[PDB]
PDB file of C-alpha atoms in Angstrom:
ATOM      1  CA  UNK A   1       9.421   4.054 -29.963  1.00 42.98           C
ATOM      2  CA  UNK A   2      10.559   6.134 -27.064  1.00 38.41           C
ATOM      3  CA  UNK A   3      14.052   5.073 -26.091  1.00 39.54           C
ATOM      4  CA  UNK A   4      13.493   6.269 -22.568  1.00 38.30           C
ATOM      5  CA  UNK A   5      10.478   3.940 -22.362  1.00 40.50           C
ATOM      6  CA  UNK A   6      11.500   0.576 -23.803  1.00 43.13           C
ATOM      7  CA  UNK A   7       8.617  -1.796 -23.145  1.00 46.43           C
ATOM      8  CA  UNK A   8       9.030  -5.242 -21.545  1.00 46.89           C
ATOM      9  CA  UNK A   9       7.255  -7.909 -19.486  1.00 48.13           C
ATOM     10  CA  UNK A  10       6.490  -7.758 -15.738  1.00 45.14           C
ATOM     11  CA  UNK A  11       4.013  -8.331 -12.854  1.00 46.17           C
ATOM     12  CA  UNK A  12       2.287  -6.110 -10.194  1.00 45.25           C
ATOM     13  CA  UNK A  13       1.442  -5.649  -6.447  1.00 41.86           C
ATOM     14  CA  UNK A  14      -0.803  -7.479  -4.003  1.00 40.82           C
ATOM     15  CA  UNK A  15      -4.100  -7.316  -1.983  1.00 39.79           C
ATOM     16  CA  UNK A  16      -6.017  -8.784   1.075  1.00 38.83           C
ATOM     17  CA  UNK A  17      -6.943 -12.393   0.520  1.00 40.96           C
ATOM     18  CA  UNK A  18     -10.368 -13.126  -0.940  1.00 39.51           C
ATOM     19  CA  UNK A  19     -10.197 -14.099  -4.592  1.00 37.47           C
ATOM     20  CA  UNK A  20     -11.427 -16.655  -7.097  1.00 33.86           C
ATOM     21  CA  UNK A  21     -11.372 -15.277 -10.625  1.00 36.04           C
ATOM     22  CA  UNK A  22     -13.793 -15.387 -13.491  1.00 36.98           C
ATOM     23  CA  UNK A  23     -14.087 -14.486 -17.165  1.00 37.62           C
ATOM     24  CA  UNK A  24     -16.431 -12.872 -19.703  1.00 38.22           C
ATOM     25  CA  UNK A  25     -18.057 -13.788 -23.007  1.00 36.73           C
ATOM     26  CA  UNK A  26     -15.764 -12.496 -25.750  1.00 38.30           C
ATOM     27  CA  UNK A  27     -12.545 -14.341 -26.678  1.00 38.32           C
ATOM     28  CA  UNK A  28     -13.193 -17.792 -25.191  1.00 39.05           C
ATOM     29  CA  UNK A  29     -12.355 -19.179 -28.594  1.00 40.81           C
ATOM     30  CA  UNK A  30      -8.594 -18.954 -29.203  1.00 40.57           C
ATOM     31  CA  UNK A  31      -7.891 -18.513 -25.566  1.00 39.54           C
ATOM     32  CA  UNK A  32      -8.780 -21.560 -23.496  1.00 38.03           C
ATOM     33  CA  UNK A  33      -5.798 -23.907 -22.944  1.00 39.56           C
ATOM     34  CA  UNK A  34      -3.625 -22.406 -20.157  1.00 35.31           C
ATOM     35  CA  UNK A  35      -4.910 -23.404 -16.747  1.00 34.97           C
ATOM     36  CA  UNK A  36      -6.071 -26.989 -16.352  1.00 35.51           C
ATOM     37  CA  UNK A  37      -8.842 -28.556 -14.281  1.00 34.74           C
ATOM     38  CA  UNK A  38      -8.884 -26.008 -11.420  1.00 38.32           C
ATOM     39  CA  UNK A  39     -12.541 -25.062 -10.797  1.00 35.98           C
ATOM     40  CA  UNK A  40     -15.186 -25.369  -8.047  1.00 35.93           C
ATOM     41  CA  UNK A  41     -17.896 -26.187 -10.588  1.00 38.05           C
ATOM     42  CA  UNK A  42     -21.580 -26.347  -9.996  1.00 35.34           C
ATOM     43  CA  UNK A  43     -23.374 -27.806 -12.973  1.00 34.02           C
ATOM     44  CA  UNK A  44     -26.822 -27.269 -11.544  1.00 34.79           C
ATOM     45  CA  UNK A  45     -28.517 -24.191 -13.016  1.00 32.24           C
ATOM     46  CA  UNK A  46     -28.995 -22.376  -9.668  1.00 31.98           C
ATOM     47  CA  UNK A  47     -26.581 -19.577 -10.771  1.00 33.75           C
ATOM     48  CA  UNK A  48     -27.456 -18.060 -14.186  1.00 34.56           C
ATOM     49  CA  UNK A  49     -24.406 -16.523 -15.899  1.00 32.13           C
TER      50      UNK A  49
ATOM     51  CA  UNK B   1       9.094  -8.266  47.682  1.00 36.26           C
ATOM     52  CA  UNK B   2       8.429  -5.709  50.415  1.00 38.80           C
ATOM     53  CA  UNK B   3       4.954  -7.093  51.093  1.00 41.93           C
ATOM     54  CA  UNK B   4       6.253 -10.666  51.082  1.00 42.56           C
ATOM     55  CA  UNK B   5       9.097  -9.704  53.414  1.00 45.42           C
ATOM     56  CA  UNK B   6       6.704  -7.706  55.589  1.00 47.89           C
ATOM     57  CA  UNK B   7       5.095 -11.078  56.261  1.00 47.39           C
ATOM     58  CA  UNK B   8       7.819 -13.675  55.646  1.00 51.37           C
ATOM     59  CA  UNK B   9       6.460 -15.668  52.684  1.00 50.60           C
ATOM     60  CA  UNK B  10       9.053 -16.006  49.935  1.00 51.15           C
ATOM     61  CA  UNK B  11       8.401 -17.474  46.497  1.00 48.46           C
ATOM     62  CA  UNK B  12       1.569 -22.044  16.662  1.00 53.53           C
ATOM     63  CA  UNK B  13       1.750 -18.850  14.626  1.00 58.34           C
ATOM     64  CA  UNK B  14      -0.007 -19.546  11.315  1.00 59.58           C
ATOM     65  CA  UNK B  15      -3.178 -19.642  13.413  1.00 60.52           C
ATOM     66  CA  UNK B  16      -2.465 -15.910  13.574  1.00 61.18           C
ATOM     67  CA  UNK B  17      -0.838 -15.354  10.192  1.00 61.08           C
ATOM     68  CA  UNK B  18      -3.924 -16.117   8.140  1.00 56.71           C
ATOM     69  CA  UNK B  19      -6.005 -14.787  11.037  1.00 60.06           C
ATOM     70  CA  UNK B  20      -4.257 -11.570  10.041  1.00 57.62           C
ATOM     71  CA  UNK B  21      -4.387 -11.787   6.271  1.00 55.33           C
ATOM     72  CA  UNK B  22      -8.154 -11.585   5.916  1.00 55.29           C
ATOM     73  CA  UNK B  23      -8.153  -8.565   8.165  1.00 55.16           C
ATOM     74  CA  UNK B  24      -5.464  -7.176   5.901  1.00 57.90           C
ATOM     75  CA  UNK B  25      -7.787  -8.341   3.111  1.00 57.44           C
ATOM     76  CA  UNK B  26     -11.090  -7.093   4.520  1.00 59.13           C
ATOM     77  CA  UNK B  27      -9.295  -3.814   4.970  1.00 56.79           C
ATOM     78  CA  UNK B  28      -8.384  -3.264   1.355  1.00 57.73           C
ATOM     79  CA  UNK B  29     -11.693  -4.258  -0.187  1.00 54.48           C
ATOM     80  CA  UNK B  30     -13.348  -2.024   2.371  1.00 55.61           C
ATOM     81  CA  UNK B  31     -11.182   0.846   1.155  1.00 55.43           C
ATOM     82  CA  UNK B  32     -12.340   0.159  -2.383  1.00 53.91           C
ATOM     83  CA  UNK B  33     -15.728   1.282  -1.191  1.00 53.10           C
ATOM     84  CA  UNK B  34     -15.022   4.616   0.449  1.00 54.29           C
ATOM     85  CA  UNK B  35     -12.517   5.290  -2.342  1.00 56.70           C
ATOM     86  CA  UNK B  36     -10.196   6.099   0.532  1.00 57.15           C
ATOM     87  CA  UNK B  37      -6.629   5.868  -0.741  1.00 56.01           C
ATOM     88  CA  UNK B  38      -4.373   4.260   1.842  1.00 56.46           C
ATOM     89  CA  UNK B  39      -1.231   5.370  -0.007  1.00 56.66           C
ATOM     90  CA  UNK B  40      -1.491   9.102  -0.446  1.00 58.26           C
ATOM     91  CA  UNK B  41       0.016   9.138   3.030  1.00 57.91           C
ATOM     92  CA  UNK B  42       3.144   7.879   1.289  1.00 54.96           C
ATOM     93  CA  UNK B  43       2.988   9.320  -2.233  1.00 54.21           C
ATOM     94  CA  UNK B  44       2.884  12.666  -0.493  1.00 56.03           C
ATOM     95  CA  UNK B  45       5.775  11.566   1.679  1.00 52.82           C
ATOM     96  CA  UNK B  46       7.787  10.184  -1.235  1.00 50.28           C
ATOM     97  CA  UNK B  47       7.462  13.222  -3.485  1.00 51.42           C
ATOM     98  CA  UNK B  48       8.033  15.347  -0.388  1.00 50.41           C
ATOM     99  CA  UNK B  49      11.257  13.417   0.041  1.00 48.71           C
ATOM    100  CA  UNK B  50      12.927  13.570  -3.358  1.00 46.91           C
ATOM    101  CA  UNK B  51      12.152  17.284  -3.534  1.00 50.64           C
ATOM    102  CA  UNK B  52      14.118  17.471  -0.323  1.00 50.52           C
ATOM    103  CA  UNK B  53      17.115  15.556  -1.603  1.00 52.25           C
ATOM    104  CA  UNK B  54      17.245  17.703  -4.727  1.00 52.05           C
ATOM    105  CA  UNK B  55      16.624  20.704  -2.497  1.00 52.28           C
ATOM    106  CA  UNK B  56      19.548  19.737  -0.313  1.00 54.82           C
ATOM    107  CA  UNK B  57      21.561  19.029  -3.464  1.00 56.59           C
ATOM    108  CA  UNK B  58      21.372  22.752  -4.072  1.00 51.95           C
ATOM    109  CA  UNK B  59      21.923  23.714  -0.455  1.00 50.32           C
ATOM    110  CA  UNK B  60      25.162  21.758  -0.183  1.00 53.62           C
ATOM    111  CA  UNK B  61      26.463  22.858  -3.548  1.00 52.33           C
ATOM    112  CA  UNK B  62      26.681  26.340  -2.088  1.00 49.43           C
ATOM    113  CA  UNK B  63      28.472  25.189   1.010  1.00 52.48           C
ATOM    114  CA  UNK B  64      30.698  23.303  -1.339  1.00 52.68           C
ATOM    115  CA  UNK B  65      31.477  26.474  -3.272  1.00 57.90           C
ATOM    116  CA  UNK B  66      30.921  29.321  -0.848  1.00 59.51           C
ATOM    117  CA  UNK B  67      32.344  27.536   2.159  1.00 59.44           C
ATOM    118  CA  UNK B  68      30.793  26.845   5.494  1.00 58.46           C
ATOM    119  CA  UNK B  69      32.388  30.002   6.854  1.00 57.38           C
ATOM    120  CA  UNK B  70      30.780  32.269   4.270  1.00 57.29           C
ATOM    121  CA  UNK B  71      27.303  30.776   4.210  1.00 56.97           C
ATOM    122  CA  UNK B  72      27.375  30.711   7.978  1.00 55.93           C
TER     123      UNK B  72
ATOM    124  CA  UNK C   1     -19.984  -9.302  -3.429  1.00 58.37           C
ATOM    125  CA  UNK C   2     -16.425  -8.269  -2.531  1.00 56.74           C
ATOM    126  CA  UNK C   3     -16.457  -9.159   1.164  1.00 56.61           C
ATOM    127  CA  UNK C   4     -17.802 -12.487   0.026  1.00 58.09           C
ATOM    128  CA  UNK C   5     -14.906 -13.446  -2.186  1.00 56.63           C
ATOM    129  CA  UNK C   6     -12.100 -12.398   0.123  1.00 57.43           C
ATOM    130  CA  UNK C   7     -13.908 -14.260   2.868  1.00 58.26           C
ATOM    131  CA  UNK C   8     -13.857 -17.368   0.690  1.00 58.38           C
ATOM    132  CA  UNK C   9     -10.117 -16.958   0.274  1.00 56.25           C
ATOM    133  CA  UNK C  10      -9.907 -17.739   3.950  1.00 53.42           C
ATOM    134  CA  UNK C  11     -11.903 -20.935   4.283  1.00 54.10           C
ATOM    135  CA  UNK C  12     -10.411 -22.038   0.955  1.00 55.46           C
ATOM    136  CA  UNK C  13     -14.023 -22.709   0.057  1.00 57.16           C
ATOM    137  CA  UNK C  14     -14.287 -22.832  -3.726  1.00 61.14           C
ATOM    138  CA  UNK C  15     -17.453 -21.127  -4.917  1.00 60.46           C
ATOM    139  CA  UNK C  16     -17.106 -22.612  -8.409  1.00 64.33           C
ATOM    140  CA  UNK C  17     -16.839 -26.344  -7.981  1.00 64.20           C
ATOM    141  CA  UNK C  18     -20.622 -26.136  -7.972  1.00 64.98           C
ATOM    142  CA  UNK C  19     -20.216 -25.256 -11.641  1.00 64.44           C
ATOM    143  CA  UNK C  20     -17.031 -27.022 -12.757  1.00 67.67           C
ATOM    144  CA  UNK C  21     -18.791 -30.168 -11.643  1.00 64.89           C
ATOM    145  CA  UNK C  22     -21.870 -29.048 -13.526  1.00 64.40           C
ATOM    146  CA  UNK C  23     -19.935 -28.089 -16.654  1.00 65.45           C
ATOM    147  CA  UNK C  24     -17.945 -31.306 -16.954  1.00 66.27           C
ATOM    148  CA  UNK C  25     -21.138 -33.149 -16.037  1.00 65.46           C
ATOM    149  CA  UNK C  26     -22.708 -31.397 -18.998  1.00 66.58           C
ATOM    150  CA  UNK C  27     -20.291 -31.989 -21.857  1.00 64.38           C
ATOM    151  CA  UNK C  28     -20.055 -35.645 -20.856  1.00 63.13           C
ATOM    152  CA  UNK C  29     -23.791 -35.642 -21.356  1.00 66.45           C
ATOM    153  CA  UNK C  30     -23.711 -34.057 -24.787  1.00 66.56           C
ATOM    154  CA  UNK C  31     -21.050 -36.504 -25.936  1.00 66.73           C
ATOM    155  CA  UNK C  32     -23.027 -39.226 -24.189  1.00 68.58           C
ATOM    156  CA  UNK C  33     -26.138 -38.239 -26.086  1.00 65.16           C
ATOM    157  CA  UNK C  34     -24.031 -37.973 -29.243  1.00 67.94           C
ATOM    158  CA  UNK C  35     -23.638 -41.718 -28.948  1.00 67.16           C
ATOM    159  CA  UNK C  36     -27.223 -42.354 -27.920  1.00 65.64           C
ATOM    160  CA  UNK C  37     -28.654 -40.592 -30.960  1.00 62.60           C
ATOM    161  CA  UNK C  38     -26.179 -42.098 -33.375  1.00 61.62           C
ATOM    162  CA  UNK C  39     -27.822 -45.426 -32.653  1.00 59.95           C
ATOM    163  CA  UNK C  40     -31.299 -44.094 -33.170  1.00 62.74           C
ATOM    164  CA  UNK C  41     -29.934 -42.594 -36.318  1.00 60.73           C
ATOM    165  CA  UNK C  42     -28.688 -45.983 -37.486  1.00 62.63           C
ATOM    166  CA  UNK C  43     -30.857 -48.537 -35.737  1.00 65.82           C
ATOM    167  CA  UNK C  44     -34.062 -46.561 -36.017  1.00 64.84           C
ATOM    168  CA  UNK C  45     -36.434 -45.449 -33.345  1.00 65.74           C
ATOM    169  CA  UNK C  46     -38.522 -48.553 -33.951  1.00 63.07           C
ATOM    170  CA  UNK C  47     -35.659 -50.955 -33.288  1.00 63.60           C
ATOM    171  CA  UNK C  48     -34.104 -49.255 -30.285  1.00 63.95           C
ATOM    172  CA  UNK C  49     -37.568 -48.826 -28.861  1.00 62.73           C
TER     173      UNK C  49
ATOM    174  CA  UNK D   1     -15.390   4.190   7.517  1.00 63.56           C
ATOM    175  CA  UNK D   2     -15.997   2.705  10.975  1.00 63.28           C
ATOM    176  CA  UNK D   3     -15.362  -0.957  10.176  1.00 58.80           C
ATOM    177  CA  UNK D   4     -12.176   0.270   8.589  1.00 59.94           C
ATOM    178  CA  UNK D   5     -10.698   1.881  11.658  1.00 59.66           C
ATOM    179  CA  UNK D   6     -11.512  -0.854  14.141  1.00 57.84           C
ATOM    180  CA  UNK D   7     -10.091  -3.299  11.637  1.00 62.29           C
ATOM    181  CA  UNK D   8      -6.868  -1.295  11.622  1.00 60.15           C
ATOM    182  CA  UNK D   9      -6.748  -1.547  15.397  1.00 61.80           C
ATOM    183  CA  UNK D  10      -6.188  -5.228  14.851  1.00 60.50           C
ATOM    184  CA  UNK D  11      -3.315  -5.324  12.394  1.00 62.26           C
ATOM    185  CA  UNK D  12      -1.808  -2.370  14.268  1.00 65.54           C
ATOM    186  CA  UNK D  13      -1.566  -0.860  10.809  1.00 65.78           C
ATOM    187  CA  UNK D  14      -1.232   2.900  11.190  1.00 66.12           C
ATOM    188  CA  UNK D  15      -3.262   4.713   8.556  1.00 63.81           C
ATOM    189  CA  UNK D  16      -1.519   8.021   9.289  1.00 67.41           C
ATOM    190  CA  UNK D  17       2.179   7.400   8.942  1.00 66.88           C
ATOM    191  CA  UNK D  18       1.470   8.085   5.284  1.00 66.85           C
ATOM    192  CA  UNK D  19       0.893  11.653   6.442  1.00 69.06           C
ATOM    193  CA  UNK D  20       3.137  12.100   9.488  1.00 69.01           C
ATOM    194  CA  UNK D  21       5.941  11.197   7.131  1.00 67.37           C
ATOM    195  CA  UNK D  22       4.547  13.650   4.617  1.00 65.63           C
ATOM    196  CA  UNK D  23       4.061  16.413   7.183  1.00 67.49           C
ATOM    197  CA  UNK D  24       7.527  16.216   8.716  1.00 64.29           C
ATOM    198  CA  UNK D  25       8.864  15.818   5.183  1.00 63.38           C
ATOM    199  CA  UNK D  26       7.116  19.083   4.416  1.00 62.26           C
ATOM    200  CA  UNK D  27       8.210  21.431   7.184  1.00 59.92           C
ATOM    201  CA  UNK D  28      11.792  20.256   6.718  1.00 61.31           C
ATOM    202  CA  UNK D  29      11.324  21.424   3.165  1.00 58.61           C
ATOM    203  CA  UNK D  30       9.992  24.845   4.066  1.00 60.03           C
ATOM    204  CA  UNK D  31      12.841  25.393   6.509  1.00 61.17           C
ATOM    205  CA  UNK D  32      15.156  23.924   3.892  1.00 55.50           C
ATOM    206  CA  UNK D  33      13.890  26.391   1.330  1.00 54.66           C
ATOM    207  CA  UNK D  34      14.114  29.123   3.969  1.00 55.23           C
ATOM    208  CA  UNK D  35      17.850  28.609   3.767  1.00 57.06           C
ATOM    209  CA  UNK D  36      17.935  28.223   0.005  1.00 58.52           C
ATOM    210  CA  UNK D  37      16.201  31.540  -0.611  1.00 59.38           C
ATOM    211  CA  UNK D  38      18.177  33.404   2.006  1.00 60.03           C
ATOM    212  CA  UNK D  39      21.203  32.857  -0.195  1.00 63.35           C
ATOM    213  CA  UNK D  40      19.457  34.048  -3.304  1.00 60.14           C
ATOM    214  CA  UNK D  41      18.361  36.956  -1.213  1.00 58.22           C
ATOM    215  CA  UNK D  42      21.954  37.740  -0.279  1.00 60.80           C
ATOM    216  CA  UNK D  43      24.078  36.311  -3.061  1.00 63.71           C
ATOM    217  CA  UNK D  44      21.715  37.246  -5.853  1.00 64.98           C
ATOM    218  CA  UNK D  45      20.125  35.095  -8.470  1.00 64.97           C
ATOM    219  CA  UNK D  46      22.957  35.943 -10.842  1.00 67.03           C
ATOM    220  CA  UNK D  47      25.669  34.676  -8.510  1.00 66.68           C
ATOM    221  CA  UNK D  48      23.999  31.512  -7.273  1.00 64.47           C
ATOM    222  CA  UNK D  49      23.021  30.758 -10.835  1.00 67.52           C
TER     223      UNK D  49
ATOM    224  CA  UNK E   1     -15.878 -51.264  27.116  1.00 66.42           C
ATOM    225  CA  UNK E   2     -18.675 -53.724  26.357  1.00 66.92           C
ATOM    226  CA  UNK E   3     -17.812 -53.818  22.657  1.00 65.61           C
ATOM    227  CA  UNK E   4     -14.105 -54.187  23.415  1.00 66.94           C
ATOM    228  CA  UNK E   5     -14.831 -56.955  25.918  1.00 64.90           C
ATOM    229  CA  UNK E   6     -17.268 -58.578  23.494  1.00 65.32           C
ATOM    230  CA  UNK E   7     -14.191 -59.084  21.328  1.00 64.47           C
ATOM    231  CA  UNK E   8     -11.220 -59.079  23.719  1.00 62.39           C
ATOM    232  CA  UNK E   9      -9.236 -56.003  22.625  1.00 63.36           C
ATOM    233  CA  UNK E  10      -8.376 -53.785  25.580  1.00 62.67           C
ATOM    234  CA  UNK E  11      -6.787 -50.348  25.333  1.00 58.98           C
ATOM    235  CA  UNK E  12      -1.224 -19.980  23.205  1.00 60.84           C
ATOM    236  CA  UNK E  13      -4.226 -17.882  24.190  1.00 63.74           C
ATOM    237  CA  UNK E  14      -3.554 -14.339  22.954  1.00 64.09           C
ATOM    238  CA  UNK E  15      -4.019 -15.830  19.486  1.00 64.59           C
ATOM    239  CA  UNK E  16      -7.625 -15.966  20.685  1.00 68.34           C
ATOM    240  CA  UNK E  17      -7.738 -12.914  22.936  1.00 67.61           C
ATOM    241  CA  UNK E  18      -7.259 -10.370  20.178  1.00 66.71           C
ATOM    242  CA  UNK E  19      -9.040 -12.787  17.836  1.00 66.46           C
ATOM    243  CA  UNK E  20     -11.925 -11.993  20.171  1.00 69.09           C
ATOM    244  CA  UNK E  21     -11.481  -8.273  20.668  1.00 70.41           C
ATOM    245  CA  UNK E  22     -12.158  -7.234  17.088  1.00 67.94           C
ATOM    246  CA  UNK E  23     -15.292  -9.322  17.129  1.00 67.09           C
TER     247      UNK E  23
END
């Protein structure tokens, strides 16, 4: 606890526009009910991971 | 006018906004690659600035206590 | 890989519908099989056939 | 490094104000110190302090 | 015209200039 650094909740700075955003293979299990149906799926195996 | 007289013969955006953003985009991702920081040109300038304000803060304390006739 | 994604920001061309399609197409095949093998599990592969 | 610079031609985004600022900010610190140490050179670091 | 008759039913830049130069 450092009273000169009380921690809180915020957001950060921006980029040049080219971005869809992925995930990895670890905590899919509790953490899966935020977004909604917002994908550009391809269920045909041409990809791999 | 002279030439004319010498003869006598008298007399929308968003297509560019996004056209800009990807350039702004392709810029930044391209700077990821050279590891070329676009903001040291300001971090330098910002730290150079507050260590001028606090450097003035000294330099005007003396004129505030020695007087602009003494220091001068 | 980078210049790709930011370039897809611009056409608004989703690179992942080719998988969201494929993923929803997949679980509604597993749960569609889940029916189709319940019957063979209760009608028998001699009856259904 | 090339595709960078020509791309900055287009946004008219100067890559060097981040230094022209810093350079003018610097010499007007040296000449600002040049005053601030003239006084310690003539008032003494016991008086100014 | 034929089809219509067969039925009877009669009837700025600089955004591209610089958009070109970088190319």
